[PDB]
Amino acid sequence: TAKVDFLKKIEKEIQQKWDTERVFEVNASNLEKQTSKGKYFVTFPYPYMNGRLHLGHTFSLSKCEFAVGYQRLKGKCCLFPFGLHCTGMPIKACADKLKREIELYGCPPDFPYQWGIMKSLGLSDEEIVKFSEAEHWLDYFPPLAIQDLKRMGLKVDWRRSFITTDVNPYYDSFVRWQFLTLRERNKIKFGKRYTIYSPKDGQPCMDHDRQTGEGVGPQEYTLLKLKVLEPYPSKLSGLKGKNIFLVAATLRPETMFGQTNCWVRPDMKYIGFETVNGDIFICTQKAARNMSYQGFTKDNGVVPVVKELMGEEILGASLSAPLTSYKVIYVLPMLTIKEDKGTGVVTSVPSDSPDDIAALRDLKKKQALRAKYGIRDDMVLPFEPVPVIEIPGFGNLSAVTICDELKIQSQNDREKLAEAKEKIYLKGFYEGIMLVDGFKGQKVQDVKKTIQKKMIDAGDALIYMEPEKQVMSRSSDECVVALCDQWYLDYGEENWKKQTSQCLKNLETFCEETRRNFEATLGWLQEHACSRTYGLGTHLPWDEQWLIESLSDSTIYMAFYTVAHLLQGGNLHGQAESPLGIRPQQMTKEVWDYVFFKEAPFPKTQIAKEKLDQLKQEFEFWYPVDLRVSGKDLVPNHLSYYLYNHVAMWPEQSDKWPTAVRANGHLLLNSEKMSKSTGNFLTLTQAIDKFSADGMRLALADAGDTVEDANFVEAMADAGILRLYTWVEWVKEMVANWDSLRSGPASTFNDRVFASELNAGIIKTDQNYEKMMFKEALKTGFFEFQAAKDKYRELAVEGMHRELVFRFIEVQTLLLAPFCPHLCEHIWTLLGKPDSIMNASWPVAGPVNEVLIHSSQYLMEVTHDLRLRLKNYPSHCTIYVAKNYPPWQHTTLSVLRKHFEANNGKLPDNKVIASELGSMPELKKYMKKVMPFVAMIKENLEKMGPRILDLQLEFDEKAVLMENIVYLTNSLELEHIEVKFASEAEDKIREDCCPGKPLNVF
Ligand SMILES: CC(C)C[C@H](N)C(=O)NS(=O)(=O)OC[C@H]1O[C@@H](n2cnc3c(N)ncnc32)[C@H](O)[C@@H]1O
Ligand SMILES: CC(C)C[C@H](N)C(=O)O
């Protein structure tokens, strides 16, 4: 317990040191004069401030944190800036939701939550009243997140942090210049388009202000109009005189030539309302909402309800359907009707829809179902399936044949209906052929749109856009697809999309699945609505009313990082003075152009040339973005617009486009989802309070480095705390007893073994750090490192050589630095080292000899087997080692060598090997042992390479054994071990013992 407290004390002291020394503040004015090794620009997409920062954000930023901790030791000058996102509606949604139940009820509010979560954060009762305005959120949460980050100890130049709404005037001017240049180059466009839309919010709902289906778009439906013919059913008598239409949703208009009736749900509530032209549409509630927002009614979003009813009161109504062969069809019931899709009204195409003919047969069999709703004989019997589309494998009546073949007798046969619908699902999309006149012998793929247009021009069909899946907004409002006018980014331009495809070709994605997602979201993208009305951010500069959504004012902000320290200089809101003395309003479009475009002319500005040149130098030095780390959730939306805007703003300078992007999965805590509902959740401050942020970073580096979800194990973090405490106390012990170690030459066998192991570990760690596999880098550089250390301590009977010990300590403190830099800086100061550890470089690795590491692993295996066999049955041990392989083993290994040499290293199957070795007489007595032997061989062939195929070992087995017999006798608690050369041994040993696998008897 006190170990974590000691760690936190060290962290706070070293953070005070890092702040007072200002070691992480980098400036292009100083670093461009010393061309050290090149720049390294990492970026973390700023998170939203609608709450404290949790462990997922920390895991996502740990990637670039460790990356800069590694690259700064390799000589590259690192830039890790960090912004803070406050654009967007979520803040406002939560706050006004709070006001809703704060003023319609009391304080505390009476029930039968949100205020509960706020008090769970622990604010004072008289302080949540101050949370009505978002101004207090932006004055409160950015400082707290910054404090949490500084307590974590990130290598950030904090003078470059800022806020993203109009509260910050400098970022506001930056966004204004961005959008002015974008609309200047025809990248923005005003127009009336379809989009997901939140009625309660009154604006298009994009991916970052939703609550379900974070990538759902609109989906098109052909909406057929069916004239309700007289005699009107009873419940409609009040609306006599006007036109009454049943609106039915479909995606297969070409099948409407074979309509027989109209399926409705008898126990669902339908609503009939008035359209814009005075007619009456009958649909469901949400269908009416969607239609109203798609300009179907007189007023946008207004549904004048003229009658509410049930499906039972609708059955038997005569209908005039479009394109049907029957001049009169009827309204029939259907019980298997989903209450979410479409209008609650489906078409009856029994020739190519299986559920339709199923229901038709259920009605046609008995008087029970046919009379079950007043459906007289005339509404079921004469309605036969109408052959309209011929699928070659089934005939003119496809669904009929496939259902009669799969032996289905229940419209409610969900398994069999699913089967039958799957069988001809797509074979009617291509292989289907029209049969009606005008289209006799047409590919249905080439006529469905023309038939849709034919119905629309006839005034019998319309377009209905619906959310492909149910979408909830930030305001708990069910989104609908609305046709609204807005300013949108035309991400569908051919030239722009092709240029971004070239950028993706040049972009470095760390896996192929990331590039797959990028190509898919590039092919899927189209006009994207960037205009909002409710929320925060920056207004459109030419249209002061339209606000900019969070996913559009956050595309090229990384250029603002390069000058945030000289424009507002640390102050988040930009209210204070400018360190360069540049007024907030003084930044004009041409000023930004000169700062960010290379060939831009110096504009007419009262700003002196020195400051503009300094900003241009900063930008032209740090850019482009070398790396952007994020979770894979921002792949389809954020990083796509990121590359798009980087291509659009600099269409001539590909050298300034993003260099690389790294995607990680979402974080799991104790193998469980991080959710406030399950009690398995850790904010950054709680995680630091519990796991000594150094150690939290350690466990995060071990959490994972793949696209799959990483796992944060608390027990692993505690184990890391214990290991670090043992390491620190061991280093203290060594500092104490330096005078109690061996001096002189590092010439002992174990000294060489440990030194080569250390150098190999250095190499493995560097190679894992370049590839950003932080889990594997930790495995090679900390765990295996400590293992080699403890092995060398165990085997060094003549005392550990001080030079090797402290070279190891130095190298370990270096390799662990990017993970737990507080403890590493503490140890670096404990060594009496003059400067801070952030100035150190990469440790140079000496020569590596594979053969001595192989002999060390050999001794390890020998010790393991010795402790195994000591279990049963002493004082003396006797070991036997074979020079050459026994004749049968030598022959089998020669055969395996031939089979390896002949075919580029592919040993045949066990079958061929057993067959050919049964074809050798010299193995007749040993065919029982031959196949096991070979088997074992194969294992090691995949375990430690082909070196086991050599007819003789790379080292002296007997001398290697004899260089550590002392440790073996001391650990095995014996009295003597005689090593004999296996030829003096008896028959069994001399016959079965092979080189590399010695035997022994006590
Ligand atoms: C520039 C702008 C358009 C970005 C925008 N401000 C934004 O996305 N803000 S945010 O508050 O949710 O995302 C912050 C980052 O943290 C990662 N992350 C979030 N949650 C988790 C989690 N549970 N587990 C793992 N990672 C998580 C996520 O990928 C994201 O990159
Ligand atoms: C495509 C679906 C919405 C409708 C289907 N073709 C049917 O007749 O039931």
mmCIF file with all atom_site columns, C-alpha atoms in Angstrom, residues 435-512:
data_model
loop_
_atom_site.group_PDB
_atom_site.id
_atom_site.type_symbol
_atom_site.label_atom_id
_atom_site.label_alt_id
_atom_site.label_comp_id
_atom_site.label_asym_id
_atom_site.label_entity_id
_atom_site.label_seq_id
_atom_site.pdbx_PDB_ins_code
_atom_site.Cartn_x
_atom_site.Cartn_y
_atom_site.Cartn_z
_atom_site.occupancy
_atom_site.B_iso_or_equiv
_atom_site.pdbx_formal_charge
_atom_site.auth_seq_id
_atom_site.auth_comp_id
_atom_site.auth_asym_id
_atom_site.auth_atom_id
_atom_site.pdbx_PDB_model_num
ATOM 1  C CA . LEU A 1 435 ? -43.030 -10.699 -67.958 1.00 0.00 ? 435 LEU A CA 1
ATOM 2  C CA . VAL A 1 436 ? -45.539 -7.859  -68.324 1.00 0.00 ? 436 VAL A CA 1
ATOM 3  C CA . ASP A 1 437 ? -45.999 -5.909  -71.536 1.00 0.00 ? 437 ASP A CA 1
ATOM 4  C CA . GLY A 1 438 ? -43.521 -3.187  -72.417 1.00 0.00 ? 438 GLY A CA 1
ATOM 5  C CA . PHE A 1 439 ? -40.864 -4.961  -70.344 1.00 0.00 ? 439 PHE A CA 1
ATOM 6  C CA . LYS A 1 440 ? -41.212 -8.476  -71.800 1.00 0.00 ? 440 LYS A CA 1
ATOM 7  C CA . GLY A 1 441 ? -37.744 -9.986  -71.441 1.00 0.00 ? 441 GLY A CA 1
ATOM 8  C CA . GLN A 1 442 ? -35.977 -7.257  -69.445 1.00 0.00 ? 442 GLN A CA 1
ATOM 9  C CA . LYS A 1 443 ? -33.290 -7.615  -66.800 1.00 0.00 ? 443 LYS A CA 1
ATOM 10 C CA . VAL A 1 444 ? -35.021 -6.463  -63.611 1.00 0.00 ? 444 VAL A CA 1
ATOM 11 C CA . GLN A 1 445 ? -31.754 -4.794  -62.574 1.00 0.00 ? 445 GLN A CA 1
ATOM 12 C CA . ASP A 1 446 ? -32.160 -2.357  -65.491 1.00 0.00 ? 446 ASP A CA 1
ATOM 13 C CA . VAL A 1 447 ? -35.860 -1.467  -65.175 1.00 0.00 ? 447 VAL A CA 1
ATOM 14 C CA . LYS A 1 448 ? -36.685 -1.119  -61.469 1.00 0.00 ? 448 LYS A CA 1
ATOM 15 C CA . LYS A 1 449 ? -35.707 2.565   -61.444 1.00 0.00 ? 449 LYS A CA 1
ATOM 16 C CA . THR A 1 450 ? -37.591 3.269   -64.675 1.00 0.00 ? 450 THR A CA 1
ATOM 17 C CA . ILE A 1 451 ? -40.702 1.528   -63.321 1.00 0.00 ? 451 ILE A CA 1
ATOM 18 C CA . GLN A 1 452 ? -40.382 3.577   -60.127 1.00 0.00 ? 452 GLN A CA 1
ATOM 19 C CA . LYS A 1 453 ? -40.189 6.744   -62.237 1.00 0.00 ? 453 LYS A CA 1
ATOM 20 C CA . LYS A 1 454 ? -43.170 5.581   -64.314 1.00 0.00 ? 454 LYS A CA 1
ATOM 21 C CA . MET A 1 455 ? -45.252 5.211   -61.154 1.00 0.00 ? 455 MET A CA 1
ATOM 22 C CA . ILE A 1 456 ? -44.077 8.576   -59.797 1.00 0.00 ? 456 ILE A CA 1
ATOM 23 C CA . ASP A 1 457 ? -44.850 10.450  -63.026 1.00 0.00 ? 457 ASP A CA 1
ATOM 24 C CA . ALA A 1 458 ? -48.292 8.821   -62.970 1.00 0.00 ? 458 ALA A CA 1
ATOM 25 C CA . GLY A 1 459 ? -48.763 10.401  -59.536 1.00 0.00 ? 459 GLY A CA 1
ATOM 26 C CA . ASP A 1 460 ? -49.158 7.016   -57.828 1.00 0.00 ? 460 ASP A CA 1
ATOM 27 C CA . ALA A 1 461 ? -45.827 6.712   -55.982 1.00 0.00 ? 461 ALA A CA 1
ATOM 28 C CA . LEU A 1 462 ? -43.503 8.928   -53.950 1.00 0.00 ? 462 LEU A CA 1
ATOM 29 C CA . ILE A 1 463 ? -40.088 8.806   -52.267 1.00 0.00 ? 463 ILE A CA 1
ATOM 30 C CA . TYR A 1 464 ? -39.913 7.960   -48.553 1.00 0.00 ? 464 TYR A CA 1
ATOM 31 C CA . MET A 1 465 ? -36.592 8.239   -46.717 1.00 0.00 ? 465 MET A CA 1
ATOM 32 C CA . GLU A 1 466 ? -36.259 6.395   -43.412 1.00 0.00 ? 466 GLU A CA 1
ATOM 33 C CA . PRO A 1 467 ? -33.395 5.797   -40.963 1.00 0.00 ? 467 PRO A CA 1
ATOM 34 C CA . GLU A 1 468 ? -32.056 2.377   -41.923 1.00 0.00 ? 468 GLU A CA 1
ATOM 35 C CA . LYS A 1 469 ? -31.971 1.611   -38.196 1.00 0.00 ? 469 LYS A CA 1
ATOM 36 C CA . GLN A 1 470 ? -33.455 3.418   -35.215 1.00 0.00 ? 470 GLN A CA 1
ATOM 37 C CA . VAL A 1 471 ? -31.229 6.367   -34.288 1.00 0.00 ? 471 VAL A CA 1
ATOM 38 C CA . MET A 1 472 ? -31.337 8.181   -30.950 1.00 0.00 ? 472 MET A CA 1
ATOM 39 C CA . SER A 1 473 ? -29.924 11.695  -30.707 1.00 0.00 ? 473 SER A CA 1
ATOM 40 C CA . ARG A 1 474 ? -28.071 13.258  -27.785 1.00 0.00 ? 474 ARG A CA 1
ATOM 41 C CA . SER A 1 475 ? -31.438 14.587  -26.553 1.00 0.00 ? 475 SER A CA 1
ATOM 42 C CA . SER A 1 476 ? -33.023 11.093  -26.365 1.00 0.00 ? 476 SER A CA 1
ATOM 43 C CA . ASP A 1 477 ? -35.010 12.016  -29.491 1.00 0.00 ? 477 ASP A CA 1
ATOM 44 C CA . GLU A 1 478 ? -35.773 9.442   -32.185 1.00 0.00 ? 478 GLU A CA 1
ATOM 45 C CA . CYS A 1 479 ? -34.096 10.796  -35.310 1.00 0.00 ? 479 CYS A CA 1
ATOM 46 C CA . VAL A 1 480 ? -35.873 10.859  -38.674 1.00 0.00 ? 480 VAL A CA 1
ATOM 47 C CA . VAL A 1 481 ? -34.583 11.379  -42.202 1.00 0.00 ? 481 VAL A CA 1
ATOM 48 C CA . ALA A 1 482 ? -35.500 14.949  -43.153 1.00 0.00 ? 482 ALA A CA 1
ATOM 49 C CA . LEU A 1 483 ? -35.119 16.759  -46.472 1.00 0.00 ? 483 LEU A CA 1
ATOM 50 C CA . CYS A 1 484 ? -33.750 20.080  -45.239 1.00 0.00 ? 484 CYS A CA 1
ATOM 51 C CA . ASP A 1 485 ? -31.668 22.892  -46.687 1.00 0.00 ? 485 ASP A CA 1
ATOM 52 C CA . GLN A 1 486 ? -28.197 23.222  -45.199 1.00 0.00 ? 486 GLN A CA 1
ATOM 53 C CA . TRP A 1 487 ? -24.563 23.998  -45.913 1.00 0.00 ? 487 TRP A CA 1
ATOM 54 C CA . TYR A 1 488 ? -22.746 20.728  -46.608 1.00 0.00 ? 488 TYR A CA 1
ATOM 55 C CA . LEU A 1 489 ? -19.246 19.618  -47.549 1.00 0.00 ? 489 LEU A CA 1
ATOM 56 C CA . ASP A 1 490 ? -19.373 17.946  -50.973 1.00 0.00 ? 490 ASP A CA 1
ATOM 57 C CA . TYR A 1 491 ? -17.231 14.953  -50.033 1.00 0.00 ? 491 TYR A CA 1
ATOM 58 C CA . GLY A 1 492 ? -18.535 13.157  -53.142 1.00 0.00 ? 492 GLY A CA 1
ATOM 59 C CA . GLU A 1 493 ? -16.583 15.146  -55.736 1.00 0.00 ? 493 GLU A CA 1
ATOM 60 C CA . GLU A 1 494 ? -14.771 12.816  -58.128 1.00 0.00 ? 494 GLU A CA 1
ATOM 61 C CA . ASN A 1 495 ? -11.535 14.825  -58.248 1.00 0.00 ? 495 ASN A CA 1
ATOM 62 C CA . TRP A 1 496 ? -11.462 15.420  -54.483 1.00 0.00 ? 496 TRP A CA 1
ATOM 63 C CA . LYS A 1 497 ? -12.230 11.773  -53.697 1.00 0.00 ? 497 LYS A CA 1
ATOM 64 C CA . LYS A 1 498 ? -9.497  10.637  -56.097 1.00 0.00 ? 498 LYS A CA 1
ATOM 65 C CA . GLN A 1 499 ? -6.944  12.996  -54.541 1.00 0.00 ? 499 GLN A CA 1
ATOM 66 C CA . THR A 1 500 ? -7.859  11.661  -51.097 1.00 0.00 ? 500 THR A CA 1
ATOM 67 C CA . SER A 1 501 ? -7.483  8.128   -52.482 1.00 0.00 ? 501 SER A CA 1
ATOM 68 C CA . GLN A 1 502 ? -3.945  9.051   -53.529 1.00 0.00 ? 502 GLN A CA 1
ATOM 69 C CA . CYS A 1 503 ? -3.375  10.424  -50.019 1.00 0.00 ? 503 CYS A CA 1
ATOM 70 C CA . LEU A 1 504 ? -4.585  7.103   -48.592 1.00 0.00 ? 504 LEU A CA 1
ATOM 71 C CA . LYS A 1 505 ? -2.204  5.259   -50.922 1.00 0.00 ? 505 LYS A CA 1
ATOM 72 C CA . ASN A 1 506 ? 0.626   7.367   -49.496 1.00 0.00 ? 506 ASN A CA 1
ATOM 73 C CA . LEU A 1 507 ? -0.715  7.181   -45.927 1.00 0.00 ? 507 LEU A CA 1
ATOM 74 C CA . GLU A 1 508 ? 0.846   4.705   -43.484 1.00 0.00 ? 508 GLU A CA 1
ATOM 75 C CA . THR A 1 509 ? -1.782  2.504   -41.817 1.00 0.00 ? 509 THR A CA 1
ATOM 76 C CA . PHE A 1 510 ? -0.334  0.053   -39.305 1.00 0.00 ? 510 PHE A CA 1
ATOM 77 C CA . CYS A 1 511 ? -2.556  -2.836  -40.450 1.00 0.00 ? 511 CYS A CA 1
ATOM 78 C CA . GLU A 1 512 ? -4.523  -3.857  -43.521 1.00 0.00 ? 512 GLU A CA 1
#
